[PDB]
């Protein structure tokens, strides 16, 4: 079967549960890739495969091939070698508003395409944004869903605690706007280097999120601009319908500079 026929397997790049990512080479092509090897809910596997295919965009990991073998499934992507956005925040502590703004721009373009194609990711966070002034590529479509335009339903309780929308935590129906909440949380980290909602106790984390209990504490927020904090407030609006859309967030002056 076609992957163990055509490809050699090298060094592990990442690992969740379910999945391992390793560098592979298409031997006859002399071409390196990332292979997401999945260690075989078959419905959810083919969905992530279909969604990865759907999405061709500078800011979205580009699926080269999907291969089904005895016991393993391979989703092969173009190799992006710049590391998680997560790692770069750790190393640099935080981004200049200059660098934060080009970054969240990169992210909003990916989120805008996803939404235009009726895909909601639901697990936006730095670990799932990969670097190539290096452009940011959205990854891990393992939790992604398909919506019809502005439809909102209960699609299930899924994602990363720190990043989860109020609507999802209340078990209210939801859609595209949960990605914009995650973008708010991301943007806030970019600017100062910790999240808006932290707590040892998950239950109290979830109370904060549902209640929008974020501040811009002194001293570190005092020199951050009005335009930046404006975007975070519009992204971190509890009302999903009132929340800034991806398209509206690209036309925001902090992102436009126009
Ligand atoms: O969709 C994913 O989960 C990961 C994709 C991926 C693409 C290129 C890499 O270098 C590493 C991971």
From Swiss-Prot:
Places the protein is found: Synapse; Postsynaptic density; Cell projection, Dendritic spine; Cell projection, Dendrite
Activity regulation description: Activated by Ca(2+)/calmodulin.
Record protein name field: Calcium/calmodulin-dependent protein kinase type II subunit alpha
Binding site for ATP: 13-21, 36
Purpose: Calcium/calmodulin-dependent protein kinase that functions autonomously after Ca(2+)/calmodulin-binding and autophosphorylation, and is involved in various processes, such as synaptic plasticity, neurotransmitter release and long-term potentiation. Member of the NMDAR signaling complex in excitatory synapses, it regulates NMDAR-dependent potentiation of the AMPAR and therefore excitatory synaptic transmission. Regulates dendritic spine development. Also regulates the migration of developing neurons. Phosphorylates the transcription factor FOXO3 to activate its transcriptional activity.
Illness the protein is tied to: Intellectual developmental disorder, autosomal dominant 53: A disorder characterized by significantly below average general intellectual functioning associated with impairments in adaptive behavior and manifested during the developmental period.
Keywords annotated in UniProt: ATP-binding, Calmodulin-binding, Cell projection, Disease variant, Intellectual disability, Kinase, Lipoprotein, Magnesium, Metal-binding, Nucleotide-binding, Palmitate, Phosphoprotein, Serine/threonine-protein kinase, Synapse, Transferase
Cofactors required: Mg(2+)
The protein's assembly and partners: There are 4 genes encoding calcium/calmodulin-dependent protein kinase type II chains: CAMK2A, CAMK2B, CAMK2G and CAMK2D. The corresponding proteins assemble into homo- or heteromultimeric holoenzymes composed of 12 subunits with two hexameric rings stacked one on top of the other. Interacts with BAALC. Interacts with MPDZ. Interacts with SYN1. Interacts with CAMK2N2. Interacts with SYNGAP1. Interacts with SYNPO2. Interacts with SHANK3. Interacts with GRIN2B. Interacts with CACNB2. Interacts with LRRC7. Interacts with GRM5.
Modified residues (Phosphotyrosine): 7
Family classification: Belongs to the protein kinase superfamily. CAMK Ser/Thr protein kinase family. CaMK subfamily.
Keyword Lipoprotein: yes
Record-level GO cellular component terms: calcium- and calmodulin-dependent protein kinase complex; cytoplasm; cytosol; dendritic spine; endocytic vesicle membrane; mitochondrion; neuron projection; nucleoplasm
Main location: other
Effect of residue 196 to L: In MRD53; uncertain significance; no effect on protein abundance; no effect on autophosphorylation; no effect on neuronal migration
Domain of life assignment: Eukaryota
Positions carrying Phosphoserine: 241
Posttranslational modification: Palmitoylated. Probably palmitoylated by ZDHHC3 and ZDHHC7.
Domain Protein kinase: 7-255
Catalytic activity as recorded in UniProt: L-seryl-[protein] + ATP = O-phospho-L-seryl-[protein] + ADP + H(+); L-threonyl-[protein] + ATP = O-phospho-L-threonyl-[protein] + ADP + H(+)
GO BP terms in the entry: angiotensin-activated signaling pathway; calcium ion transport; cellular response to interferon-beta; cellular response to type II interferon; dendritic spine development; G1/S transition of mitotic cell cycle; long-term synaptic potentiation; negative regulation of hydrolase activity
Enzyme Commission number(s): 2.7.11.17
GO molecular function: ATP binding; calcium/calmodulin-dependent protein kinase activity; calmodulin binding; glutamate receptor binding; identical protein binding; kinase activity; metal ion binding; protein homodimerization activity
Naturally occurring in which organism (per UniProt): Homo sapiens
Gene that this polypeptide is encoded by: CAMK2A
Record: active site: 123
Keyword Cell membrane: no
């Amino acid at each position: 079967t076609r992957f163990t026929e055509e490809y050699q397997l090298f060094e592990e790049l990442g690992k969740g549960a379910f999945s391992v990512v390793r560098r592979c080479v298409k031997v006859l092509a002399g071409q390196e890739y990332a292979a997401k090897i999945i260690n075989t809910d078959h419905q959810k596997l083919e969905r992530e495969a279909r969604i990865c295919r759907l999405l061709k965009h500078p800011n979205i990991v580009r699926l080269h091939d999907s291969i089904s073998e005895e016991g393993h499934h391979y989703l092969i992507f173009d190799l992006v070698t710049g590391g998680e956005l997560f790692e770069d925040i750790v190393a640099r502590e935080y981004y200049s508003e200059a660098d934060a703004s080009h970054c969240i721009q990169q992210i909003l373009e990916a989120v805008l395409h996803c939404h235009q194609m009726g895909v909601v990711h639901r697990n936006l966070k730095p670990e799932n944004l990969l670097l190539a002034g290096a452009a940011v590529k959205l990854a891990d479509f393992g939790l992604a869903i398909e919506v019809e335009g502005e439809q909102q339903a209960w699609f299930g309780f899924a994602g990363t605690p720190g990043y989860l929308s109020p609507e999802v935590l209340r078990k209210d129906p939801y859609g595209k706007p949960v990605d914009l909440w995650a973008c708010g949380v991301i943007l806030y980290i970019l600017l100062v280097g910790y999240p808006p909602f932290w707590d040892e106790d998950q239950h109290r984390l979830y109370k904060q999120i549902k209640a929008g209990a974020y501040d811009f504490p002194s001293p570190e927020w005092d020199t951050v601009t009005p335009e930046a904090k404006d975007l975070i407030n519009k992204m971190l609006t509890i009302n999903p319908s009132k929340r800034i859309t991806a398209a509206e967030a690209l036309k925001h002056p902090w992102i436009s500079h126009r």
